[PDB]
């Protein structure tokens, strides 16, 4: 009986002029601080310049996109868009467990394509079991 | 030891809690059997189209490498899976030529057992 949705339109960022970076830093924000989140993301993607650009980050963001979730524990597809919010949430949630020094340092999990693919593998292994529904 | 001449049947006996597929020669000698509970589906999912399909495909490409090409499937009993027990045999090699249903119905023979509350 919510009867509506608005999807909350967004606005792109100056660097990389991309619309996914804005969603990523929005999920990265804490206590309503966007500037420091952008700073941390930029330091992280520049630290990732060891090995290309944010292309490798956005492709690593694909390996954490599940195709079916269990929610009598019935499996079902999630949505064509909630996939890139579960992927971002899982990446950001499991990048805060790395025992590195800084946030930009422990965010170096895009090259681990490492606690991010494990979640998708467990989801697929738990969804392929309850396939008779 | 049993002759596997290329004319046979597939007895699909289903019920309210399981299903059993048996590919059999044209003389009654069973060649290869399979069951939903046999295919690691122990629980309330034995009576499901996916379980029936897996149980059928288990024995399909087992009796296939024996000399069986044409089947005269006999279906018996109620329950789900009668569809995707012939679907995933005709879609897995061996070809079906009949869908004869031989579900037994008594003509007021015996007393049904004590309607359950």
């Amino acid at each position: 009986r919510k009867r509506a949705a608005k999807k909350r339109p967004l606005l792109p960022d100056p660097r990389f002029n991309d619309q996914l970076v804005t969603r990523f830093v929005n999920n990265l924000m804490w206590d309503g601080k966007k500037s420091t989140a952008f700073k941390v993301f930029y330091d992280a993607i520049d630290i990732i310049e060891t090995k290309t650009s944010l292309e490798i980050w956005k492709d690593a963001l694909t390996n954490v996109m599940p195709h079916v979730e269990v929610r009598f524990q019935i499996p079902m597809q999630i949505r064509p868009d909630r996939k890139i919010s579960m992927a971002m949430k899982w990446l950001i949630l499991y990048a805060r467990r790395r025992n590195e020094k800084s946030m930009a340092q422990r965010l170096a999990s895009e090259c681990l394509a490492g606690a991010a693919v494990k979640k998708r593998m467990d989801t697929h292994k738990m969804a392929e079991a309850n396939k008779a529904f | 030891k049993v002759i596997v001449e290329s004319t046979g049947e597939a007895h699909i006996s289903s019920t309210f809690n399981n299903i059993i597929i048996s590919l059999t020669n044209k003389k009654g000698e069973v060649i290869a059997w399979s069951s939903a509970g046999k295919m690691g589906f122990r629980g309330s999912k034995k009576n499901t189209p996916y379980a029936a399909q897996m149980a059928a495909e288990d024995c399909s490409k087992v009796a296939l490498e024996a000399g069986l090409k044409k089947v005269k499937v006999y279906v018996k009993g109620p329950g789900n899976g009668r569809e995707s027990a012939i679907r995933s045999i005709h879609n897995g090699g061996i070809e079906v030529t009949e869908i004869i249903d031989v579900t037994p119905m008594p003509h007021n023979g015996c007393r049904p057992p004590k309607r359950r509350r």
């Binding site: - | 309210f16 109620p78 009668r82 569809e83 012939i86 679907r87 005709h90 879609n91 079906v96 030529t97 009949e98 869908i99 004869i100 249903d101 031989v102 579900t103 119905m105 008594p106 007393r111 049904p112 057992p113 004590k114 309607r115 359950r116």
Partner: protein, 55 residues
Amino acid sequence: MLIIPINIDRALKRYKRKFDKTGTVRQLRARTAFIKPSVVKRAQIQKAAYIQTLK
């Protein structure tokens, strides 16, 4: 019996709908349990009365 001669999905759907039409998908769920005449004779006087009042 329900012998049906013979794509495969078309013939399978034909067989399934013939099986649902011949009145058996609900004939065995009635024989799974025991219905004594004292209860099988009221489902007629409560059905005929409904069909009559629906006229």
